[PDB]
Write an enzyme that holds these catalytic residues in place. Structure first.
Site, mmCIF file in Angstrom:
data_model
loop_
_atom_site.group_PDB
_atom_site.id
_atom_site.type_symbol
_atom_site.label_atom_id
_atom_site.label_comp_id
_atom_site.label_asym_id
_atom_site.label_seq_id
_atom_site.Cartn_x
_atom_site.Cartn_y
_atom_site.Cartn_z
ATOM 1 N N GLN A 17 79.277 53.761 35.607
ATOM 2 C CA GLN A 17 80.166 53.196 34.562
ATOM 3 C C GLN A 17 81.569 53.733 34.543
ATOM 4 O OE1 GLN A 17 78.740 52.652 30.639
ATOM 5 N NE2 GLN A 17 76.644 53.288 31.255
ATOM 6 N N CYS A 47 76.644 50.144 30.142
ATOM 7 C CA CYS A 47 75.419 50.033 30.936
ATOM 8 C C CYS A 47 74.947 48.597 31.138
ATOM 9 C CB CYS A 47 74.316 50.847 30.259
ATOM 10 S SG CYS A 47 73.982 50.360 28.506
ATOM 11 N N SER A 137 76.791 46.673 24.217
ATOM 12 C CA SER A 137 76.634 45.226 24.119
ATOM 13 C C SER A 137 75.302 44.913 23.509
ATOM 14 C CB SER A 137 76.752 44.623 25.543
ATOM 15 O OG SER A 137 76.341 43.261 25.579
ATOM 16 N N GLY A 194 70.178 53.347 22.905
ATOM 17 C CA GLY A 194 69.832 52.130 23.619
ATOM 18 C C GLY A 194 70.493 52.107 24.976
ATOM 19 N N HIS A 195 69.804 51.570 25.976
ATOM 20 C CA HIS A 195 70.325 51.561 27.353
ATOM 21 C C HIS A 195 69.745 50.386 28.094
ATOM 22 C CE1 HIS A 195 72.173 53.374 30.848
ATOM 23 N NE2 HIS A 195 71.034 53.466 31.503
ATOM 24 N N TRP A 212 69.017 53.558 36.845
ATOM 25 C CA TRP A 212 69.578 53.676 35.505
ATOM 26 C C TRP A 212 71.032 53.334 35.364
ATOM 27 C CZ3 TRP A 212 65.789 54.081 32.088
ATOM 28 C CH2 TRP A 212 64.630 54.805 32.406
#
Lengths: 254, 4
Positions: A17, A47, A137, A194-195, A212
């Site tokens: 990122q 992410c 998001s 959260g991911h 990831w």
């Protein structure tokens, strides 16, 4: 469960990122009160954008973007002055997949770095990214729409929610995608936030390979009810993305 | 917008 070797590792795909993936995201404008400055730095790609871009690179698709996208940042975002509108001219894009490399060590050309940064910025815009030092998001529901409407992926693309299936039928859908050489977008929430990430393989023993989106950090084999990378968590405890799970499946070109 |  069939054994499927990591689809993204097989293609050398390892995005992150930060730099050089975030060279075209918005530049942070304000110091949030009580925080250190990030002013003048590009925002994280998010992410959700990194997971989606790694899947798009797996397909090298589309060559041409289909439809532009515009949205306005939440007025509660402390990193920008308001109102702040973002626009990506996706309908005019010709993505050159030879320049959007599978990964970046730093030695790549500026053209190659800008190519991946333009993809990350367009994907992030198309999912209404709440940009910052970290960028968030809504994830799946926006990803599935963007892939079809902005990037021209097949109408097979759709979100599935963990709560709508038994464990067996949920995992069987993941396995069918992997059997078709189709990496899966996945997200969840829990006590380390959260991911979003990518499921791209399986070991035959009900563990799945996870990328990831942190450049390789914590990638490996995880059960879908213990998506718990050791790179997160401060203080020594446990945590993972085990609640409110959803995925975007059927990801393949028109 | 909490998936990061």
């Amino acid at each position: 469960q069939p054994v499927v070797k990591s689809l993204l590792n097989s293609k050398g795909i390892h995005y992150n990122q930060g730099n050089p993936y975030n060279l075209l995201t918005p530049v942070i404008e304000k110091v949030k009160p009580g925080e250190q400055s990030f002013v003048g730095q590009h925002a994280a790609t998010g992410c959700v954008a990194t997971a989606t871009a790694q899947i798009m690179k797996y397909h090298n698709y589309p060559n041409k973007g289909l439809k532009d996208y515009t949205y306005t940042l939440s007025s509660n975002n402390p990193y920008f002055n308001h109102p702040k509108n973002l626009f990506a001219a996706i309908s005019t894009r010709q993505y050159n997949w030879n320049n959007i490399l599978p990964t970046y060590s730093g030695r790549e050309s500026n053209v190659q770095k800008m190519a991946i940064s333009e993809l990350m910025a367009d994907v992030g815009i198309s999912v209404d990214m709440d940009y910052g030092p970290s960028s968030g998001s809504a994830g799946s529901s926006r990803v599935q729409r963007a892939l079809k409407e902005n990037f021209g992926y097949n109408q097979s693309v759709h979100q599935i929610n963990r709560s709508d299936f038994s464990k067996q039928d949920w995992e069987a859908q993941i396995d069918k995608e992997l059997s078709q050489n189709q990496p899966v977008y996945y997200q969840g929430v829990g006590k380390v936030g959260g991911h979003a990430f990518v499921i791209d393989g399986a070991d035959g023993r009900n563990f799945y390979h996870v990328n990831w989106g942190w450049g390789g950090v914590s990638d490996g084999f995880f059960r879908l009810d213990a998506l718990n990378p050791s790179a997160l968590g401060t203080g020594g405890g446990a945590g993972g993305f085990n609640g409110y799970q959803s995925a975007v499946v059927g990801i393949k070109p028109l | 917008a909490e998936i990061x």
